[PDB]
Amino acid sequence: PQITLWKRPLVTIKIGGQLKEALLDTGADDTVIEEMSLPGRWKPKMIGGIGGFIKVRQYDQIIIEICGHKAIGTVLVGPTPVNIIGRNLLTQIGCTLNF
Amino acid sequence: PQITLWKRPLVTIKIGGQLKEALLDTGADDTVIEEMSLPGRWKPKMIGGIGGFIKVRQYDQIIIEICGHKAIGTVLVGPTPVNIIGRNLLTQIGCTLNF
Numbered sequence A, B: 001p002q003i004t005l006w007k008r009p010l011v012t013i014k015i016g017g018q019l020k021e022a023l024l025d026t027g028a029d030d031t032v033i034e035e036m037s038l039p040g041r042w043k044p045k046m047i048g049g050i051g052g053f054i055k056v057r058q059y060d061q062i063i064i065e066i067c068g069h070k071a072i073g074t075v076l077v078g079p080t081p082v083n084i085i086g087r088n089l090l091t092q093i094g095c096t097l098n099f
Helices: none
Strands: A010-015 A018-024 A043-048 A053-066 A069-077 A096-098 B010-015 B018-024 B032-034 B043-049 B052-066 B069-078 B096-098
Touching: B018 B032, B043 B069
Parallel strands: B032 B069
Antiparallel strands: A010 A018, A010 A053, A043 A053, A053 A069, A096 B096, B010 B018, B010 B052, B043 B052, B052 B069
C-alpha cells in the first residue's frame, strides 16, 4: 500500500504470535524491538541514535510479520523508545520511498 | 524518484545557502540539522530517540531544498550525529512509503 507521512508510519507487526505496533523507519539501518522474549542465542551489538548509544541483543533469522508481509531476519532487542522496522526488513517487504 | 532501501537514503539538501547531505528519515517527527547558524528567533527544545534526548534550537519557517523540491518548515539545529529530514518536510516534497 501507500503510506503518507502526515502522521507516524506505525503498523501492526506480529512477532512470536503477539501483535505489536512498530514504526516503519527509513532512518534506521536495523530493526529494534522493546524488551521481550525471543528464542535462540544472541550476540552483543551497540547501536547509535539521536541521543547516544545503547546496547542491544541481536537475534538472527527471526520470523516477523509486518503489515501482512512475512519477513525473516535480524531483530535487535533493547531499550528503544518505540518498536522500529529498519531497512534490513523494509527491503524484505519491498518498501521504497517515492516522490 | 523511487529510492530503494538497500543502503541509507541520503540526499543532497540546501539550507541557509549551504549544501549538505541528509538522511530521509520516516522515523523522525522533526528535521534535525547538525550545528550551524540560521537567521531568526529560536527557542530551546528537547528531542529524544535511541539513546536518550538532546537539546536543540528550534527555528521556524526555514526554507530547505531537498532533491530540487523546495519546502518550508521548522528546522531543529543541534548535536545530531547525522543530518535528518523528518516527516514535517518529507510530506511537503510529496514523499511516501510504498510496498
